Amino acid sequence: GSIYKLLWRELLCFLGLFMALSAAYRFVLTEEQKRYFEKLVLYCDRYASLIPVSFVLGFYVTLVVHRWWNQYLSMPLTDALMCVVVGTVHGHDERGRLYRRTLMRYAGLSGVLILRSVSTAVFKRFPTIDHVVEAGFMTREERKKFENLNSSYNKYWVPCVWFCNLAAQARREGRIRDNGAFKLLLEELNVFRSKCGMLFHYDWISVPLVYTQVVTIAVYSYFLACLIGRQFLDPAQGYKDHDLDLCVPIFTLLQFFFYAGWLKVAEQLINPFGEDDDDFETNFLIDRCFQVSMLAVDEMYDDLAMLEKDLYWDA
Amino acid sequence: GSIYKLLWRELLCFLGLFMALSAAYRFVLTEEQKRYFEKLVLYCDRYASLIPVSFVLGFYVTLVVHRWWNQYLSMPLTDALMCVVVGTVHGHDERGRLYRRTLMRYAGLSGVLILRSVSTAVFKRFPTIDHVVEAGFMTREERKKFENLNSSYNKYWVPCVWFCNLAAQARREGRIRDNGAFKLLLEELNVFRSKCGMLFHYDWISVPLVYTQVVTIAVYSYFLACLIGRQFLDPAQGYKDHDLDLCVPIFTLLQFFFYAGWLKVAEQLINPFGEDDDDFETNFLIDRCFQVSMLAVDEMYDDLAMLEKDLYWDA
Amino acid sequence: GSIYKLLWRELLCFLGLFMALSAAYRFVLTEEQKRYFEKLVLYCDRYASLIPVSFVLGFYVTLVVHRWWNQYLSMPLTDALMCVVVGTVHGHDERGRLYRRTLMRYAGLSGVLILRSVSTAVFKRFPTIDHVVEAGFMTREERKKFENLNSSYNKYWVPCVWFCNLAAQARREGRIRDNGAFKLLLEELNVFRSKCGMLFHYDWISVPLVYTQVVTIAVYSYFLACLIGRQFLDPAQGYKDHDLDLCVPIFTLLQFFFYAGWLKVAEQLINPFGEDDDDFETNFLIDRCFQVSMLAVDEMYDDLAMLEKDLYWDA
Amino acid sequence: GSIYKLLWRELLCFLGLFMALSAAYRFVLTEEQKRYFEKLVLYCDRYASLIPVSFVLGFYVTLVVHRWWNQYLSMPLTDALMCVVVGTVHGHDERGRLYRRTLMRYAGLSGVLILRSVSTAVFKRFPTIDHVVEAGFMTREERKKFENLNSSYNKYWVPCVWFCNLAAQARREGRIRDNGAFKLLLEELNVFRSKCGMLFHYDWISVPLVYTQVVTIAVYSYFLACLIGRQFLDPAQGYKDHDLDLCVPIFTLLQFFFYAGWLKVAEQLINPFGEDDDDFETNFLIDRCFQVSMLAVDEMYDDLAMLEKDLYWDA
Amino acid sequence: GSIYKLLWRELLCFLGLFMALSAAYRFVLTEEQKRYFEKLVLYCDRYASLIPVSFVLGFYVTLVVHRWWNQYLSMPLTDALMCVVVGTVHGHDERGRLYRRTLMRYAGLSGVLILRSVSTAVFKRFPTIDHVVEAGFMTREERKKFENLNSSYNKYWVPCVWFCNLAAQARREGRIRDNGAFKLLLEELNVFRSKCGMLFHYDWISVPLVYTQVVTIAVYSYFLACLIGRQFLDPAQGYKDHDLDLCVPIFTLLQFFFYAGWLKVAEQLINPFGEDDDDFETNFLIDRCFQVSMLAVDEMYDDLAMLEKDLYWDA
Ligand SMILES: [Cl-]
């Protein structure tokens, strides 16, 4: 996830363009056109203004990393919902634990149906709905009701409607004994369902393409002025601030490390759900929230220790 | 949606103003006034300070793109409301499903009445209330009660009041069986109704016109210093840092690409509801939220699969 | 609301100070003190650093426009409250509609009592409480209970207490039939009452006076260096980068347009409730929210169309 | 509260250090060490870079004024709680109004116990708990239960626990008739109690001391380069851009006005609860919220005018 | 916690690299390679641009200190939960106070299980679950149910599920007499449980490693240009702006104090839960919230003073 694995495709390209026009400057650039080349090394360095290109990167990247962080906070986690389903949806019997496992499956299913439409790392795991059936998130007969819906949009909201038709059926049977308990379930669904709704909206509406193009112009307009205006010309010709020939442009690479590396921060955070190294481990999070929910609402329902005293009960 | 479709109206204008004063400088600008012109190429370049004009664009555009993003988050979506109406408003009969379809129509109607007053792409689809009647959002007799209201303001809030008079009538008939269920409906209306209220307020109160005018001065004060202070004068006259004649101002266009392109980000995001390419697809969102609501509260009400076991029921 | 109506009081002042010390420089400034004046045109231009003065304006104005926008979002609007009073407070009779009109009057009254203490445009409309009685927001006998309160603070919170004593009286008589309905009323009052509380606090605590004074020093320290360090001296004396005499300082006015215009953004947004052109139209908003509330809770209570089918009922 | 009362302790110090090394430069600095002094006026001015010191102040002060504003928004105000206690806690009798006055005293007491631990202006008013007893916020026998708690931490949360033991006792006696009314009281306590909890946390965790020290280095590293690199040396020695002797460094004080004044914004906002002029008037707010609460829940409980018609009842 | 304890490891290193190449420049650098060294002191100072390195630090550190502050606000505090458990969970008997102490132990336990996985200062206090048993947060038999859960993830959420199975058992026995009281408990758990969930997510997702590497390049690319381009060469050779020899680079250390000290702000705030001096005192907060919760829900339950009159009861 470091800078050396992203920049080396552009680093060997920058050495391949710099020293090719520097070594051939000594021999292939003849004296009738070497004089034509000395007029540019004080020209391209004149308009090479490195404050506004460092300015436009600063306000663009902090727009991205604020948007990249807000994409992470709206990750669909069922952890705030598994504490309500184990609290409210009751019953030790076969039907009672079948409600709690199904209700958390619908929340786990509707986090898969949105993450397979925004993450390439999840879509390579669930390419079709047959792979969501065989994983265990959707049953065989819920795939018939899913695919017989006349809708040409994304159908990630469908299990969040099956949640409400199931939580209202548990209320009618008395497995949600209270009435604020039933309101608490639908309150904590719409917080979860809005978290799936934000990830659809950060994917639908991106950072604007022209503002991505303006910063990409400015960095790649700088590296054309830097490519020519910081060339090592002949020392014996007696120019202003030019009587040396390092024959290796050692410092200007450190301004390619830093300017293009600043832009490469914004490149891999413009769509952080991909197969990068600093991506959100979404396939880790799908297997996590599906495992710990079926642990919490099924094998931890009303399984408590004895109410025994504390160590500090009278100390 | 790229930068080449917005800037070319100003790009051919900038070549038409630069080289017209550069080609006629050699011939039409005679020697008695060529000497008058050489006094300006070191003068307009002296006060051409490109750090503060790049400064004022940075803080202005990030005000816009934060306001442009906050305009998008307050888009009226009925998705958080269709999970409550299918959960609470009950009844399989003719009257029961007529409540759920009407209640989501009033939310869909009151998202149209505000988006046709803030979006030009929606107002070209619904120019009059007769086009909202014929689309299906308002019935023929709800248009009589709409137009017989003595109000000279925007009447987008009217279906959100019809929502409350209908949801309180469903409660009195027992189709909202609970009491926290009825409170949950009016709670999730005022979240939706405030989302319509924000879009009226981002439209009513804009980015201030003087702050739009300050940045427009600074960019167009720079391109008058750049138009004269970066002219290619004669090489044989022996000036400071001027003994070349490219005859094509190749780099200064790359500072017109980037400065005016930075401002053009703020131009098309100052009113993102128009007919641009990176606009919010509001006509897509109106047809989406009206279709998937009448799917969710009518054809998906209490239509569940059998409660069948998971694949991981004992694994 | 443009920049030409705010800056012209300082624009004629800047021409009156620039060319007065430029035209009298040629004639009134004699040669024994013309030599004393040439020592300053390369001195005041030396310390004329235009990056930090453009820096301090950038972080100060974006503090203001974020505070100016947050002042607007806390505007007291009764629109979120008129949907609850028409939903919960019932009764078609004389007493029942007298509850709904009074309850929305108290919310409309307590938005006037705070906006007449923060807006000069409202205080010129309601100079005394007799003008709030004659407008119709406070009755004749509620002015006796208002003025017989031993309190030396602002009494904007008084109608929000009359709201709670009335909404608890409607609950005791059964005109609020439910119990979550009564909780929903007091929940949506404290959201409204905190909106009146924020406007009292943005008015009580301002942008700090020293931080307003630091930016006002820096702009007016720049325009003393610009007033002298950018003077047009004699061309025939042979100075560095000075052999011209435009006799009209055309570009330096474009740095007065932009620096002082940037500060004038922060001047008219430091108290946006005044009588400016880009002010919040508070007198428009007071007449709006008082009209559409008495329309919504009185003439639209339980006045619905027939529940008739949609156009898409089986399509 | 202006800049002239904070900077004059450093302004007379800056004149006392500048002209002491300028007047003694002409006479006490002899010619063998005057030549040693001319090597520094072009050296200290060389590294005197005023863009990064203006940079580090910009991002540091806007961290402070955002934290200073967030300290103000978490001020403990009982105004959102006095509308619930007058609404829910009932009874016209002696015991009924003794509940409402005590419940708002506990909220008023627990705003004093935290503000006397974060404000020096309140701690000079309440130095001991005996001064909180004699002011009237804590009774004589609640001081016995307060001081007999084995706790070595701050005990500001103690009246917020007495609030819950009293509001649950009013519910058991039927003076809170409803059940959502009792939930609304404890909901609006934890909003108030978190407001007292934030002020303890802005006081406990400050702006980091190293980041306060970095900006203090940079400003006071600038004023050592400015103290020497902008000295007025002899005009007759013929240096670069130095042939004048104003004998009064008039412009460099305007860069001490602005750089040190920018830092002095962050000095008096790093702890805004002190005895400054732009402090939050906390002793005004303690006497305000204690007076208007005992007015609202005691002398305004169920004291309404007659329900009389509006001026616009049929117009 | 100051800057002198962090920078001295790099401060003695910077003197050890500067004057080693300055003292040996006079003697060890012979005249055939002293001429080779004079070509670099005007070269490394040429590309030493200190505005963009001060730029990239500004936007990076304010990302950190906003993330460092948001890490602090999501600290798990049981103070908002101890007011609900003393209010709702009733009973003076042995079983009744055993519910309140256990319910606040589970909140105190689930703040330890997450802080021992994000703080090194807590993990050195609780290295194993046997040290959480012996401290008193987990009983001997709750450690059997904890370690017999088939889960390979972090099990910090386990006591928040034991909270819901206990709060639903107290409701079934009538120790939570109401129904909104039971909803208020699970509402204020999910606020607390999300606070533990954020600290797991600020630890799981950090500031991106490439953006940490870009700023570390730019500072350490500056201090190679500063190490050579600001060397004190011989005065008698007659170079541009170089005829002095301080023999102690006094000002350039003040740009190492400030640039590296700015980065050291971001170094110790990138993981503020460690054993630093400005860390969050988490071991103070664990002992605080465990002590004051067992004080508030056990020894302060229904222990009130007599309802006695105020000092201002008729004044
Ligand atoms: Cl509720």
From Swiss-Prot, chains A, B, C, D, E:
Q: Which GO terms describe its molecular function?
A: bicarbonate channel activity; chloride channel activity; intracellularly ligand-gated monoatomic ion channel activity; ligand-gated monoatomic anion channel activity; ligand-gated monoatomic cation channel activity
In this UniProt entry, which residues form the Cytoplasmic topological domain(s)?
58-213
Q: Which stretches face the Extracellular side?
A: 27-35, 231-249
How is this protein's activity controlled? Chloride channel activity is allosterically inhibited by GLUL/glutamine synthase (GS) which affects the gating at the aperture in the absence of intracellular glutamate. Inhibitory effect of GLUL is relieved upon increasing of intracellular level of L-glutamate.
> Which keywords does this chain's UniProt record carry?
Cell membrane, Chloride, Chloride channel, Ion channel, Ion transport, Membrane, Transmembrane, Transmembrane helix, Transport
Q: Mostly located where?
A: membrane
What GO terms in the biological process aspect are recorded for it?
Answer: bicarbonate transport
Q: Which family is it part of?
A: Belongs to the anion channel-forming bestrophin (TC 1.A.46) family. Calcium-sensitive chloride channel subfamily.
Q: What is known of its domains?
A: The C-terminal auto-inhibitory segment (AS) modulates the open/closed conformation of the channel and determines paralog specificity among bestrophins. In a closed conformation, the C-terminal auto-inhibitory segment constricts the channel concentrically by wrapping around the channel periphery in an inter-protomer manner.
Protein name per the record: Bestrophin-2
Q: What is the lineage of its organism?
A: Eukaryota, Metazoa, Chordata, Craniata, Vertebrata
Gene symbol?
BEST2
